[PDB]
Design a protein around this nucleic acid. Structure first.
Ligand SMILES: [Mg+2]
Ligand SMILES: [Mg+2]
Ligand SMILES: [Mg+2]
Lengths: 405, 171, 206, 234, 137, 208, 16, 30
RNA sequence: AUACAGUGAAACUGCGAAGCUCAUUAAAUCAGUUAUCGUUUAUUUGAUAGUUACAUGGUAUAACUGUGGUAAUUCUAGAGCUAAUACAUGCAAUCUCGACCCUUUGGAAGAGAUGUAUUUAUUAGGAUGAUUCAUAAUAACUUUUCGAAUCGCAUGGCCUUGUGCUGGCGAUGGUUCAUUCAAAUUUCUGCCCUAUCAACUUUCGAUGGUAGGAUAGUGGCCUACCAUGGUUUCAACGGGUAACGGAGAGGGAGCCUGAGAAACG
């Protein structure tokens, strides 16, 4: 398939972003810069972007920045920045409670939860210990905040009161997710275990101990996600594998690795687009779309700069990603689905776009891991492809050798 | 929003003070610069007077000093290992002063071989067993002595002697 | 809609009102910077190539490059201070009162008002090196003889006006540079003399 | 603030309080605002050479007035203690010295006396490239001083070159001039320097009438040896 | 000495492990002046104190006071009490008043509740501390 | 040279190899603009290994990124480092590019730092490649006649130009010795005899 | 402690 | 310990009281 | 005035823009006084930088010419110009030790030596009562700073007659230090009635220690860990007051410039 980069850094990694613009000012004579198309004006954070989320209304977007730490809200109808609001500390996570941008809850890195309303900062509260994730239950009207401590703190917006926190067996919860159809909860502990809780009662239904035959090194559950249907569950391990679980069974339906060995930050189910059996798994380096049932890579999005988050506009082929660079990359896959309503004529200009292009399909090994895996004899053969410090490998063959070693 | 005024605080006797005036610009504070290892990104901040401060939001290299041999080399920073104030900074790989980090040993190793003609006269080349072990590993423990959020640098020095033993116990 | 067509080689420009909707339709759905074939726009335009450069709508708001819409939006534009102003998108559509076009290439026939007419440049070079580039002067040749002069006649009085050459090498600049060098040298001499006198005083004290 | 009320103007100027609403505000310069006499006051309200501010401005733009050998054209230039004011049209040379009341007195002097002044060494430090220098009370930074010169000493500055011709150490039995406190303007001889580290030092001074008084160290200005001042006194 | 998460050291004092000339860790100290004898327990001690007037980066300048220690229940600081007589004109009589001053104490000084301490002013050490113990008796 | 780059098939010109040799010489020229033109014509020749590292070579010619590219592209064991197989093809291009940078006079603090940076990357190179860099410095100096004969200096070679070239060569060797120190690779042809002829050159000039 | 601050009122005559 | 919020306080916080209202329908599943 | 040369709209640069009305507050306001070795500081004043060039580019446009849109604005797009103290780039020396003691002021072989700014590490350490102070050096670092591509008036002294060399008084700029004008914190003291106001503070820091973040800087100013402290019957805390005897520019929130503002912009 074909991936089009509508906006972002078209320059490679070693080239620094800031120099390019000054040299771009010198290169302003170039016709292409004049003819460049920008979907959203001021769609770039000052130095980097932490998180990006699209309002459920579909007509607004929100994002968080690095310096000065700030919140940008973009109006798709006007294709520009509605406003930017500075904050006292950087944002770890946030959620948009209302269908629009009006009400949102932001979890800062200074241990404080900040409630943002249309006019400004409505209220700020502090939790007992540092938080790493946040989620909101509509039915129960409670906001759940993971933290370094074992407790999973619980705040009720209806009563405006903190309540009894759920006591996790393990210390720490990297990510928390709630299942809309079911109400289940998941918590990603530092140890290789995911604990499921009930919001109706306050009880631990069960735990999954993630099992990795391929890799014996310790790992953490970085991210968790629930599919719309409600019987399927996705996990992300710090070592860099993604597990899809049918909740009724206790074994992984499929284990696909990104291959670079980096943490898995975000997992999205592309149920809206069509051919629901597609999932997105994102590292810092690469975010790849692959088929749920069979594990065949549909497409891949390799930005030059690292990825802090990826967000999918529902029902469309467009993706937004929060990156370390000044611009926020947005990728359009015409095959996956039609362009959003607001940018209707983006389809007409598909030729002009970059049309960016192996990394997703194949696995990558570090040089040290090659020596441990007894793959040195293979070195110098077709089975492996040299990429930079390490050498690529076929996914299945890696599993066999690691089982051997 | 950040202020450094003492008026909001309680008095010594415990009395609750009322607001005496609005916040002024000569008593301000700015958001912390959460430096992290990565491609160099620095932000210039216009301060009181014409002076300027450099906000190292991201930095992957630093000028680290081997004090015993009296040399300084520019090396890549691998990651933060230990921070006395908060372990959350260690978890997120945040660079600040006094943070114990791991740095590449390649330039220091090359300099030592070049100067003393020995892989890492013999009495002078002798160094601490712990430092040699780290050199064998490939990464050296160093302490950041610069303030990245102010000067925009991540300079530091290699741990040695009592400092190294103490932190090794702490690790 | 009116077509404001400009031939920049001549420096000429003229407007053509187009009453029939058909030319306007073949213009539709394009973007600023794209090119269109004149023959579709008409036989008199046969062989011409027009680049779309901008335009204004029935409410007077301009088109902006980079904004990809056929309708107006309020964008945050700068004339550091930024204000929100209504501006039209870059997609040509039926709502355009006037469309600006540039003639990239000439066709078979000559347009009466553009290809057949010329408009001289208003001003000429003023820096010495620009004069040299215009006339290709050698270094030995003096720009002073080649300065462009304009005749002005007020009543029966008449005289020539010429610009003041900028970045021209004159004795005054050489004198200033020599003075600066001499001043620096003299300052160094004096400071070394003072240091030597202080050293002699210390030697006497010791 | 940029406007000064005449009743709020400093005492030592001797200005009449009922002249009107505003007094001159001394501009920034060698001497502090509260220890300076702006040229407008000196030329108009002391010498009576000018009848109003405009006439003083005319005189200054004529470049007849020199302060320490340099022509000054700012009306509110803050002339101060031990400053030499020269009017060549009259061939008049003046030196500013407080009186016993505590007010500047216009003391006429010879040309030779006008050629030099006295400066109290307020600071001594090594500058860049290891060049020693002294900062005097009037803001003059003089490089390559005599090594024996220290803080609180006095240096006789040649106005033409701005170089130290001679110096006087601060020691008991030296002739001193008070430049602050209630004893401002009094002249005496040092008797004892009481020292409080971390606090203001004290100096006891005895006048020719054998009356003794105590003044802080900062307010002392060594002007010569007893019976042999380096400057003509009024 | 190393009872904290961070390593306590005198800043910019370097001990070269390679040279290993002397067993004793190099110690930097200064005399605060005012004829206040710098105690030897600071010179040959092992403590590290950034706010000690003799080994820390704090300078004694300004008012010098005297007082009686009233509390020593906190770490490296004490509360002294200064007493005086306040004059009431309506009854033409004096009455006893007192003020409590929190003062930082360097570990080089050993103070009990009741002894007489002379203290010197320094920069704000904390919210309420502006004085430093410089002599005990 | 801009015309040379624009040729569709520079490899197929009447004299491509001889043109290629001269292009290499220009790549080492002090004027960075010549290097960009000379490099561009070299890239016109189709070579897969060079095409892989084309951006890195261009970054090296760029002044603003010269420092960053060295630490990333050339550092031993670095992720961007050239593969061992491709060292042979790319390094000759790298050596000339660094040679041209070294020839740039040290007239400002920035230029002094750039000269230091060029010499500081040598320890990353393998010994055969460092020897090549020293050889490139000594090609200009003509010394084969001196040691071929019984060590007599030619008067025609005695010119102010020659001494200037020798001062440039000796400064590079001094800078190299300071960095590599005991690791410095010493050869008779590449370093020692150009060095010796330089001393013999100074004595003849000073006396004559 | 002595202020050593010049007081204008002391030097002014109060004869009136 | 209670200072800086390090202990959990269950008193009602007025500004966020009635910030959001629960959905009466409940979860999609019975 | 054959480059212009007097005056000069417009335009581009530079500098400065820093009375009223409401509330009320007991030594938290204010007054006197102390410190900044704990800080920022336009301007004034005094010192202070030997480390293609007979002068580079548009990587540049305005005013202006001309074509138009709109009901319309200190609303507008297209085409064509042209400048800088605007924007970018950028370049044949001096001092020591000094043999020969040749001449005895003196010349002089050779050996040497040679910016500034930021950050870190390390070494040495004239000034103050006191310093890790001033200063110097070593090794590196840097979105490596600065180190006259400027202007007015005058046309002197030389000669090697080339418009060759060397030049007088000013203006505008620029690094650092000190001074001055300011600002911010800060030590001690300072007339009401009160117990029918005896506990107050940890009430999302209260008192203190270690480290970090921020600030122009000290400092719970803020954050992580740790100890349980701090004020008070010698009146804490609370209450009343002839305590006129601090706030805002339609209402809250966020941001921008400057030496100086959370700006009556
Ligand atoms: Mg209309
Ligand atoms: Mg000045
Ligand atoms: Mg601190």
């Amino acid at each position: 398939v074909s991936v089009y980069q509508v906006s972002g850094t078209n320059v490679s990694r070693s080239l620094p972003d800031w120099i390019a613009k000054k040299r771009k000012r010198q290169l302003k004579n170039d016709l292409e810069y004049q003819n460049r198309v920008e979907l959203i004006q001021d769609f770039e954070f000052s130095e980097a972007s932490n998180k990006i989320k699209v309002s459920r209304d579909g007509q607004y977007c929100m994002a968080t920045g690095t310096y000065k730490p700030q919140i940008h809200v973009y109006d798709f109808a006007n294709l520009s920045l509605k406003f930017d609001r500075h904050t006292d500390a950087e944002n770890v996570d946030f959620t948009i409670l209302s269908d629009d941008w009006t009400k949102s809850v932001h979890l800062q890195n200074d241990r404080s939860i900040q409630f943002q309303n249309k006019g400004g900062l409505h209220y700020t509260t502090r939790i007992p210990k540092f938080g790493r994730s946040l989620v909101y239950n509509k039915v129960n009207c409670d906001l759940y905040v993971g933290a370094s401590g074992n407790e999973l703190y619980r705040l009720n917006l209806e009563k405006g009161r903190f309540l009894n926190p759920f006591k996790l067996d393990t210390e720490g919860v990297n990510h928390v997710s709630i299942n809309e159809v079911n109400g289940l909860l998941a918590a990603g502990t530092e140890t290789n275990v995911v604990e499921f809780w009930d919001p109706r009662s306050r009880s631990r239904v069960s735990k999954l101990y993630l099992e990795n035959n391929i890799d014996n090194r310790p790992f953490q559950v970085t991210t968790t996600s629930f599919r719309n249907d409600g019987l399927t569950f996705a996990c992300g391990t710090s070592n860099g594998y993604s597990y899809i679980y049918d909740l009724r069974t206790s074994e992984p339906s499929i284990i696909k690795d990104q291959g670079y060995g980096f943490d898995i930050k975000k997992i999205i189910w592309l149920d809206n687009v069509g051919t629901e059996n597609k999932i997105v798994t994102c590292d810092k380096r690469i975010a790849k779309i692959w088929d749920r049932l069979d594990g065949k890579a549909y497409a891949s999005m390799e930005p030059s700069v690292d990825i802090n988050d990826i967000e999918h506009v529902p029902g469309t082929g467009m993706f937004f990603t929060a990156n370390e660079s000044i611009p926020m990359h947005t990728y359009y896959i015409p095959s996956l689905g039609p362009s959003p309503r607001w940018c209707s004529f983006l389809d007409s200009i598909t030729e002009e776009l970059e049309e960016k292009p192996v990394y997703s399909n194949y696995r990558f090994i570090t040089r040290d891991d090659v020596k441990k895996l007894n793959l040195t004899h293979l070195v110098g053969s077709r089975v492996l492809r040299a990429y930079m410090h390490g050498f690529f490998i076929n996914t299945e063959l890696y599993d066999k050798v690691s089982l051997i070693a | 929003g950040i202020s450094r005024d003492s008026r909001h605080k309680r008095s010594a006797t415990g009395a609750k003070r009322a607001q005496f005036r609005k916040k002024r610009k000569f008593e301000l504070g700015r958001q912390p610069a959460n430096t992290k290892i990565g491609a160099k990104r620095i932000h210039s901040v216009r301060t009181r007077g014409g002076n300027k401060k450099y906000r190292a939001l991201r930095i992957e290299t630093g000028n680290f000093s081997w004090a015993s041999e009296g040399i300084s080399k520019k090396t890549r920073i691998a990651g933060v290992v230990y921070h006395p104030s908060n372990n959350e900074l260690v978890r997120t790989n945040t660079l600040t002063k006094a943070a114990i980090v791991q740095i590449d040993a390649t330039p220091f190793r090359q300099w030592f071989e070049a100067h003393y003609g020995q892989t890492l006269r013999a009495a002078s080349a002798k160094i601490e067993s712990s430092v040699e072990s780290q050199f064998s590993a490939g990464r050296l423990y160093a302490c950041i002595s610069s303030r990245p959020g102010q000067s925009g640098r991540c300079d530091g020095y290699i741990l040695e002697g009592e400092e190294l033993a103490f932190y090794l116990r702490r690790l | 809609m009116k077509l404001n067509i400009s031939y920049p080689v001549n420096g000429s420009q003229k407007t053509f009102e187009i009453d029939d909707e058909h030319r306007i339709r073949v213009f539709f759905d394009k973007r600023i910077g794209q090119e269109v074939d004149g023959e579709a726009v008409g036989d008199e335009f046969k062989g011409y190539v027009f680049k779309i450069s901008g335009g204004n709508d029935k409410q007077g708001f301009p088109m902006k490059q980079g904004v990809l819409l056929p309708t107006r939006i309020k964008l945050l534009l700068t004339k550091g201070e930024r204000k929100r102003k209504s501006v039209r998108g870059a997609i040509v559509g039926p709502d355009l009162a006037v469309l600006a076009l540039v003639i990239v290439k000439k066709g078979e026939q000559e347009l009466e008002g553009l290809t057949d007419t010329t408009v001289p440049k208003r001003l000429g070079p003023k820096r010495a090196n620009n004069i040299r580039k215009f006339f290709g002067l050698s270094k030995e040749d003096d720009v002073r003889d080649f300065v462009i002069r304009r005749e002005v006649t007020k009543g029966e009085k008449t005289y020539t006006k010429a610009p003041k050459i900028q970045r021209l090498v004159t004795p005054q600049r050489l004198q200033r540079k020599r003075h600066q060098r001499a001043l620096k040298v003299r300052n160094a001499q004096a400071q070394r003399e003072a240091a030597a006198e202080y050293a002699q005083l210390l030697a006497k004290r010791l | 603030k940029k406007h000064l009320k005449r009743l709020a103007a400093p005492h030592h100027w001797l200005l009449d309080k009922l002249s009107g609403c505003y007094a001159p505000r001394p501009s920034a310069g060698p001497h502090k605002l509260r220890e300076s006499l702006p040229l407008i006051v000196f030329l108009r309200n002391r010498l009576k050479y000018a009848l109003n501010g405009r006439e003083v401005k005319a005189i200054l733009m004529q470049r007849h007035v020199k302060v320490d050998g340099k022509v000054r054209t700012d009306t509110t230039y803050p002339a101060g203690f031990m400053d030499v004011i020269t009017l060549d049209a009259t061939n008049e040379n003046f030196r500013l010295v407080y009186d016993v009341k505590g007010r500047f007195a216009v003391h006429r002097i010879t040309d030779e006396e006008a050629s030099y002044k006295l400066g109290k060494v307020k600071k001594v430090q090594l500058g860049k490239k290891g060049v020693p220098y002294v900062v005097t009370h009037d803001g003059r930074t003089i490089r390559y001083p005599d090594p024996n010169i220290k803080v609180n000493d006095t240096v006789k500055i040649d106005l033409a070159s701005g170089k130290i011709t001679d110096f006087i150490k601060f020691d008991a039995g030296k002739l001193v001039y008070v430049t602050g406190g209630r004893n401002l303007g009094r002249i005496g001889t040092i008797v004892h320097k009481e020292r409080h580290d971390g606090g203001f030092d004290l100096v006891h001074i005895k006048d020719s009438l054998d009356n003794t008084f105590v003044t802080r160290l900062n307010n002392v200005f060594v002007i010569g040896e007893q019976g042999k001042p380096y400057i003509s006194l009024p | 000495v190393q009872s904290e998460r961070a390593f306590q050291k005198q800043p910019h004092i370097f001990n070269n492990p390679k040279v290993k000339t002397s067993k004793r860790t190099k110690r930097w100290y200064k005399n605060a002046g005012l004829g206040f004898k710098t105690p030897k327990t600071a010179i040959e001690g092992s403590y590290i104190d950034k706010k000690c007037p003799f080994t820390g980066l704090v300078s004694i300048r300004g008012k010098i006071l005297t007082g009686t220690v009233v509390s020593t229940k906190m770490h490296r600081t004490i509360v002294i009490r200064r007493a005086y007589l306040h004059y009431i004109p309506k009854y033409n009589r004096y009455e006893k008043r007192h003020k409590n001053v929190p003062v930082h104490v360097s570990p080089a000084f050993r103070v009990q509740v009741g002894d007489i301490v002379t203290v010197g002013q320094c920069r704000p050490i904390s919210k309420t501390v502006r004085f430093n113990v410089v002599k005990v008796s | 040279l801009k015309t040379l780059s624009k040729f569709k098939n520079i490899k197929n010109v009447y004299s491509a190899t001889e043109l290629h040799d001269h292009l290499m010489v220009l790549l080492g020229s002090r004027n960075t603009d010549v290097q960009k033109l000379a490099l561009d014509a070299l890239l016109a020749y189709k070579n897969p290994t060079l095409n892989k590292y084309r951006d890195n070579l261009k970054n090296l010619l760029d002044d603003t990124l010269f420092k960053d590219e060295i630490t990333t592209f050339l550092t031993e064991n670095g992720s961007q480092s050239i593969k061992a197989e491709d060292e042979k093809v790319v390094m000759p291009y790298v050596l000339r590019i660094f040679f041209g940078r070294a020839q740039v006079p040290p007239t400002s603090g920035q230029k002094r730092s750039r000269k230091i940076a060029v010499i500081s990357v040598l320890p990353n190179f393998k010994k055969p490649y460092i020897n090549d860099f020293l050889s490139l410095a000594s090609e200009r100096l003509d010394y084969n006649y001196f040691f071929g004969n019984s060590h007599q200096i030619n008067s025609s070679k005695a010119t102010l130009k020659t001494i200037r070239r020798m001062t440039g060569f000796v400064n590079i060797v001094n800078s190299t010795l300071s960095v590599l120190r005991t690791n410095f690779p010493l050869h008779t042809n590449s370093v020692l005899q150009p060095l010796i002829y330089s001393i013999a050159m100074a004595y003849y000039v000073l006396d004559t | 402690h002595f202020e050593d601050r010049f007081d204008a009122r002391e030097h002014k005559d109060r004869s009136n | 310990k209670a200072s800086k919020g390090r202990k959990l306080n269950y008193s009602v916080q007025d500004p966020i009281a009635n910030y959001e209202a629960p959905i009466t329908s409940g979860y999609k599943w019975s």
